[PDB]
Amino acid sequence: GRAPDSVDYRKKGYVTPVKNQGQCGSCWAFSSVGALEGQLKKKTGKLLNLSPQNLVDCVSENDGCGGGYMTNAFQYVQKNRGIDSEDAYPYVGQEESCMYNPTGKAAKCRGYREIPEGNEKALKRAVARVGPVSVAIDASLTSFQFYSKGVYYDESCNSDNLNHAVLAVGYGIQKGNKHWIIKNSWGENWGNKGYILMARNKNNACGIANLASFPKM
Ligand SMILES: *[C@]1(O)CO[C@@H]2[C@H](C#C)CN(C(=O)[C@H](CC(C)C)NC(=O)c3ccc(-c4nc(N5CCN(C)CC5)sc4F)cc3)[C@@H]21
Numbered sequence: 001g002r003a004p005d006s007v008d009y010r011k012k013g014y015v016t017p018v019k020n021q022g023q024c025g026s027c028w029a030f031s032s033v034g035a036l037e038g039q040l041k042k043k044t045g046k047l048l049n050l051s052p053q054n055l056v057d058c059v060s061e062n063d064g065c066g067g068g069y070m071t072n073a074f075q076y077v078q079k080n081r082g083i084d085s086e087d088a089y090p091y092v093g094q095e096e097s098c099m100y101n102p103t104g105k106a107a108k109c110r111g112y113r114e115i116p117e118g119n120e121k122a123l124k125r126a127v128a129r130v131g132p133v134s135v136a137i138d139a140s141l142t143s144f145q146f147y148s149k150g151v152y153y154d155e156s157c158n159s160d161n162l163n164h165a166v167l168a169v170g171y172g173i174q175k176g177n178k179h180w181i182i183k184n185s186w187g188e189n190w191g192n193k194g195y196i197l198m199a200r201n202k203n204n205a206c207g208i209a210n211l212a213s214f215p216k217m
């Protein structure tokens with residue numbers, strides 16, 4: 001069974017508005033909540049902002065504003081038996097004491113799956129079947145950071161230099177250039193209303209399929 005040629009989970013109401021992480025190195029936490037928000041919508045029919053601050057403060061196997069992995073975040077939610085809503089545990093952009101409150105719990109996690117390393121076909125199939133998928137990329141180039149439009153490709157991107165965590169919310173094509181639809185956490189003023197289209201099936205450009213995972217619930 002082949003997946004659809006294009007998919008956009010924003011059209012299905014799976015994707016919350018674009019957030020701004022500020023100076024804190026919490027990309028991993030926004031990536032993780034985005035993937036959880038998608039699964040929560042699929043489960044309950046309700047689209048709700050989940051708490052990246054809950055993750056920043058409480059995932060002891062991560063480094064708060066110094067960075068983290070999404071898989072560690074999913075493990076925390078699984079162990080903790082929940083994650084709070086944004087409303088119950090708001091974002092402040094600095095690491096603080098863990099103040100998780102189970103009465104504000106808005107989602108749970110049964111585990112996570114990792115996409116086979118470097119496999120863009122497997123990533124495509126996972127996005128199609130599951131929903132938004134957490135991904136890591138090389139976002140270090142100024143060409144990435146100044147993105148405004150089109151399908152982003154830069155030969156200098158290094159798939160071994162994973163330095164940013166974002167969310168793949170779909171995939172498709174523009175002017176014949178296959179792409180991934182990527183939600184960033186640098187605010188709506190960045191990119192195209194907070195989004196970037198990144199080259200798809202161009203030899204795993206920017207490491208898009210090197211550290212991709214999604215939560216189960
Ligand atoms: C994002 O916001 C983007 O910029 C900053 C960083 C820079 C520059 C890179 N960032 C990250 O979060 C990356 C994301 C990956 C997916 C590419 N991750 C890390 O930088 C990172 C991962 C994991 C850890 C980590 N620390 C642990 N410690 C901390 C010390 N403590 C005493 C014990 C536990 S466990 C662990 F997995 C740190 C950083 C952001």
